[PDB]
């Protein structure tokens, strides 16, 4: 006994009730950078110790 | 500003605005003037009975007396933003002779209410005190 297939009603109102923005952080994360590049950032950091 | 005009376009039919005069500004701040007092979180809303409340909060900027607010609002000084946000927004009673019809604009020949009256808000607000 249908019944309603789909709706977007009250979904914007639900989302805005709480639309959190991620906190900004210094120093960019390196996940997904080149492995060749990130090899030479380890060799860089070693050389100043 | 240009900014604060283009905000008021969006709100118009919930609002009746316009240009004050030195009579209506004096009457607001003397009769209905309250002042917000405290840290971010809680401010208290205190009645303007003496200048020492005004003095301690706005004594940075000049503005020692209640009469020096009235200059800074009427002229629009460099320290308007500070002196305006000091004042807790005014709480007016309903106008003695009523409105016409809050559906319609102050323009239109049905004589309604919303929108901006260039000067004639002064005649309204003197009844709402």
């Amino acid at each position: 006994a249908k019944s309603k297939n789909h709706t977007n009603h009250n979904q914007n109102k639900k989302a805005h009730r709480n639309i959190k923005k991620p906190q900004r952080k210094r120093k960019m994360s390196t996940k997904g950078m080149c492995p060749k590049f990130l090899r030479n950032q380890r060799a860089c950091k070693r050389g100043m110790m | 500003n240009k900014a604060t005009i283009e905000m008021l376009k969006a709100v118009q039919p919930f609002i009746t605005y316009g240009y004050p005069t030195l009579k209506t500004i004096r009457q607001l701040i003397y009769k209905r003037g309250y002042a917000k007092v405290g840290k971010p979180g809680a401010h208290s809303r205190i009645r303007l009975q003496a200048n020492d409340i005004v003095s301690q909060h706005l004594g940075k900027y000049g503005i020692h007396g209640v009469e020096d607010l009235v200059h800074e609002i009427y002229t629009c000084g460099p320290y308007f933003k500070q002196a305006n946000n000091f004042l807790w927004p005014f709480k007016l009673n309903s106008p003695r002779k009523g409105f016409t019809s809050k559906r319609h604009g102050y323009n239109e020949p049905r004589k309604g209410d919303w929108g901006n009256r260039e000067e004639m808000i002064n005649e309204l607000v003197q009844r709402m005190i």
């Binding site: 979904q11 989302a15 639309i19 959190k20 923005k21 991620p22 960019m28 996940k31 950078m33 | -």
Partner: protein, 154 residues
Amino acid sequence: TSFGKRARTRQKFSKGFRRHGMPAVSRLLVIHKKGDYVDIVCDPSVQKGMPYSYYHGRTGIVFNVTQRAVGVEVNKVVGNRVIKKRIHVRLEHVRKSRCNELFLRRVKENDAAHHEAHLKGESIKTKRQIPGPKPGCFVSGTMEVLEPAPFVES
């Protein structure tokens, strides 16, 4: 409906009018240092590395530069939250952004303006002014008397 990598693309991925053929060489000689803004516009002429349709026309920060691609961090609402998403994309599909360039000019003049006072005691308070109310002057010229118009059908 139907979901495909390029569904409803039609008008969106169309090359343009009289704009057919491959990218020019001067647009392919642009450099992109990481920590820099770029608008992702995808041209259908090159099918290699084109981004997904949602990211088309989105500005975001370059985090990586692969040899033949640019890692761009853009951000994306998913109901309750923004989430920063990391999308690689071919060099042709990236434009240089021009969104920051007023601010970049501004700091060079503004930092040099604060610098040069020194012993005059700075306190300039450098700031844009939004064009609000005009002051008054007298004005005079040739006139015309208009009246309202009678109706005509035509």
